[PDB]
């Protein structure tokens, strides 16, 4: 309940919290021993969870179908944009040690600060995936994104954008020490 | 009764024998959560016959968990049903009923898949190619330092003890280079000549560190010095020596 | 700090299961008599087996440093 939760939060889609492709983490099992506005409070919460497989999704499905090696190094910031959250659900676990009694609005509660930033970095993902943007251009719509208006999905972006001006600045080592280009053939 | 009774009253049995659990029960919720998930059961239909098993705790299967992943097989739960390590799903454990929990171990059995394939690689020698065997060679130096991690976590269980969310999270970055090695061992068991069935490896193994080029490629590079070996020993004997090492034409060169 | 998989829910907590392979000196006694039970299952009732324990660490260590000498 405030593990099971915690674990379709995660990467599982669970069985309780169905993963459905039209609409993802649906309870629909009325649990009497859940209050009948926890539902509700479960539907304000399950589209972090969704957002939170979707992140996974990507990360799991691709390493062609989405490469040159800028997406490779999106990958590897999106692993760890999703870090502090695996952080979050291990205090919740251990809140839990301390006091069981508490609420699924409590749970939803302490998770209200990454519905701040999971919604905001999910629309540039659906527009990586949307539009044919896969090369360096994806250190641009990152960078249009990453001056945003809020601290946390600042932070976020710029893990994803530091990440692949890395690879960037390899590639001009190699172009100012080798003299060599197409070091990744074209983008 | 006596050294029975004390064997069952403090220690398991009553998970390769189907009997009832002696985990400690009470009433209502942790405790015995039974009445309350037998009401549930019933109200929804449990189709025709109650959802009930021989019932295991929690941290039978972490161990299990981390033998399975440690590199040893074969386990009560993780049969090898055909080829492939699966979840033994004629387990109950109560709440989830299971399902989730198959989930979750579904995709814990796969990743112990891709260890069953680097120990079986391993056990085709142990109980000559000379470029497979100086890369099994590799493959026991990281397994060596990688199965210590897991006995160091497993102590921990018994000294109280922790939960199979921290353990898993635990094993991070090992998995991540461990999904690295499946892609590395795919091209070594793909295959006619010996020179071929070599460089379809050591050609995937030096286009890989381009790939990453973290901790993943210094592990790869550590991996690949230690697969040419054979060839740069060959190619000195064919410096000093004045002769190609012949190995039914293991080298390059025809000759 | 684990909370078990089996129920969830305001525990009171109990420690963990221990095993079977854990502590693996003090539970000879009584499997040395359950080995004798199941080799007399097959040998009809009467093969036996002595030394279902004996003696110590240190007491057998002196009498087989005593055997090399030639004290018996």
């Known amino acids: ?187 | 009764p006596d050294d029975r009774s004390w064997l069952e009253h403090h220690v398991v049995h009553q998970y390769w024998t189907a009997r009832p659990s002696q985990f400690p029960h009470s009433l209502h919720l942790h405790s015995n959560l039974a009445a309350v998930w037998d009401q549930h059961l019933y109200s929804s239909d449990p189709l025709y016959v109650p959802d009930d098993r021989v019932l295991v705790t929690e941290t039978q299967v972490i161990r299990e968990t981390l033998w399975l992943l440690s590199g040893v097989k074969k386990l009560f739960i993780f049969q090898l049903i055909d080829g492939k390590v699966t979840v033994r799903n004629n387990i109950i454990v109560t709440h989830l009923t299971h399902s989730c929990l198959r989930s979750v171990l579904e995709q814990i059995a796969a990743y112990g898949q891709v260890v069953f394939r680097l120990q079986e690689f391993i056990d085709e020698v142990m109980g000559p190619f000379r470029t497979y065997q100086a890369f099994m060679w590799a493959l026991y130096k990281y397994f060596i330092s990688f199965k210590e991690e897991l006995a160091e976590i497993e102590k921990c269980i018994i000294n109280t003890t922790i939960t199979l969310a921290i353990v898993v999270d635990k094993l991070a970055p090992r998995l991540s280079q461990l999904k690295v090695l499946h892609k590395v061992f795919s091209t070594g068991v793909a295959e006619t000549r010996n020179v071929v069935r070599a460089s379809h490896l050591l050609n995937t193994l030096y286009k890989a560190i381009l790939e990453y080029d973290e901790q993943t490629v210094s592990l790869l590079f550590s991996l690949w010095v230690e697969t040419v070996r054979p060839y740069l020993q060959t190619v000195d004997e064919w410096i000093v020596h004045g002769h190609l090492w012949d190995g039914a034409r293991e080298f390059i060169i025809q000759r | ?72």
């Open chain 1, 1 to 187: 309940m405030i593990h099971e939760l915690l674990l379709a939060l995660s990467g599982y889609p669970g069985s309780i919290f169905t993963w459905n492709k039209r609409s993802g983490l649906q309870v629909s099992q009325d649990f009497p021993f859940l209050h009948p506005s926890e539902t509700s409070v479960l539907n304000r919460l399950c589209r972090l969870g969704t957002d939170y497989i979707r992140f996974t999704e990507f990360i799991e499905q691709y390493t062609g179908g989405l490469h040159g090696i800028y997406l490779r190094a999106f990958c590897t910031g999106l692993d760890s944009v999703l870090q502090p959250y695996r952080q979050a659900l291990l205090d919740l676990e251990q809140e839990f040690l301390g006091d069981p009694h508490l609420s699924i609005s409590h749970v939803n509660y302490f998770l209200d600060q990454f519905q701040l930033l999971f919604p905001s970095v999910m629309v540039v993902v659906e527009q990586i995936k949307s539009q044919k943007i896969h090369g360096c251009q994806i250190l641009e719509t990152v960078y249009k994104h990453s001056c945003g208006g809020l601290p946390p999905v600042r932070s976020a972006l710029e893990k994803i954008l530091a990440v692949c001006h890395g690879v960037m600045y390899k590639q001009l080592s190699a172009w100012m020490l080798h003299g060599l280009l197409l070091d990744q053939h074209e983008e």
């Open chain 3, 1 to 72: 700090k684990r909370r078990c998989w089996e129920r969830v829910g305001c525990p009171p907590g109990h420690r963990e299961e221990p095993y079977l392979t854990e502590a693996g000196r003090d539970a000879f006694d009584k499997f040395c008599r359950l080995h004798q039970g199941e080799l007399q299952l097959l040998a009809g009732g009467v093969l036996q087996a002595p030394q279902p324990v004996l003696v110590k660490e240190c007491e057998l260590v002196k009498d087989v440093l005593n055997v090399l000498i030639g004290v018996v």
